[PDB]
Amino acid sequence: MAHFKEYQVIGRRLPTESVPEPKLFRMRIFASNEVIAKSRYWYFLQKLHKVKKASGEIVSINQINEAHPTKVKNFGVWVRYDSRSGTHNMYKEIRDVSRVAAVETLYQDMAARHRARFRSIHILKVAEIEKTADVKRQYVKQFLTKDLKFPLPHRVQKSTKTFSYKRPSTFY
């Protein structure tokens, strides 16, 4: 659609005479529209038990908005997927801009290295990094200093006109 947001999917199974108020399952599924998030909810929760699968109801479907988009810190999401050569329980600590943008950038990297299938990407708990010490990443702390200057080559010159006295160059 546009961007994988966050929704609130809550289940209750069958609050009837059989099992009055089971456990009320609730997670934080990250998906685009309100269609994929429903299936991934059943995909991440395959530990359900013998009741009925035809009872695909939602307690209160809504939309968990991005918590503080301007707040830029460090987060960690455990990457898990089952390929054909086995599996990989990975975990990155890349500096995320928001709290949901990490998932979008995850599809730009994991599919660029080990070719992660879209029907195998698992979503677990999202960790949060505030202080140092526990930070085992060097490339993250290096880019996070104070009053640091650096030159930047390469420049954009998007044009189509066949007339120029500028003599194109790259300086930024």
Partner: protein, 197 residues
């Protein structure tokens, strides 16, 4: 708008230089590339060498009339690369060849006029901080170039002559620029400095 568009070879590529040119040659626009000796590529001289081991068939592999189809002389000829981007089999490219007056090095005095460039023709907008350098002057010399110290000498004679011409060309226009700031105290820069003039 303009009848003939002349493109200079001041640090230009090969296939990238004939990008928007293909859209012009199909329209019958005269475009000429000057200074073939001044051709740089954002690559390497290393790979660019083997141009004979895999370069021949389907004609008469020894003839002089119906044998090979060009591709001979310093790799083959920068002229062959421009044809492949134009519908040669149709007359939409046949008449284009009459417009495409690209020879070698110095053509008829067209470089002494307009030297407009194409945004995606230079290597300056396409070079990685660490990419090797390519020299056609050494590439042509690699396979035994004829006029090595001749062409380079002829080009040098024009650079010196232009240096003496640009000296007086920047002279008379200097008096105009100097009288462009001291003559704005009247009624010219007191009502035009708020509209764009």
């Amino acid at each position: 708008v303009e009848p003939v568009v002349v493109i200079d070879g001041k640090g230009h590529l090969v296939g990238r230089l004939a990008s928007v040119v293909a859209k012009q040659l199909l329209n019958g626009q005269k475009i000429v590339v000057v200074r073939a000796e001044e051709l740089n590529i954002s690559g390497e001289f290393f790979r660019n060498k083997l141009k004979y081991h895999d370069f021949l068939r389907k004609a008469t592999a020894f003839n002089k009339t119906r044998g090979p189809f060009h591709f001979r002389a310093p790799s083959r000829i920068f002229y062959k690369a421009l044809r492949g981007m134009v519908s040669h089999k149709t007359a939409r490219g046949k008449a284009a060849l009459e417009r495409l007056k690209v020879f070698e090095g110095i053509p008829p005095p067209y470089d002494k006029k307009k030297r407009v460039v194409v945004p995606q023709a230079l290597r300056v907008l396409r070079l990685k901080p660490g990419r090797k350098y390519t020299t056609l002057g050494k590439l042509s010399t690699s396979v035994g170039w004829k006029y090595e110290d001749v062409v380079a000498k002829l080009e040098a004679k024009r650079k010196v002559s232009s240096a003496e011409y640009y000296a007086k060309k920047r002279a008379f226009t200097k008096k105009v620029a100097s009288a462009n700031a001291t003559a704005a105290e009247s009624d010219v820069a007191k009502q035009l400095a708020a509209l764009g003039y």
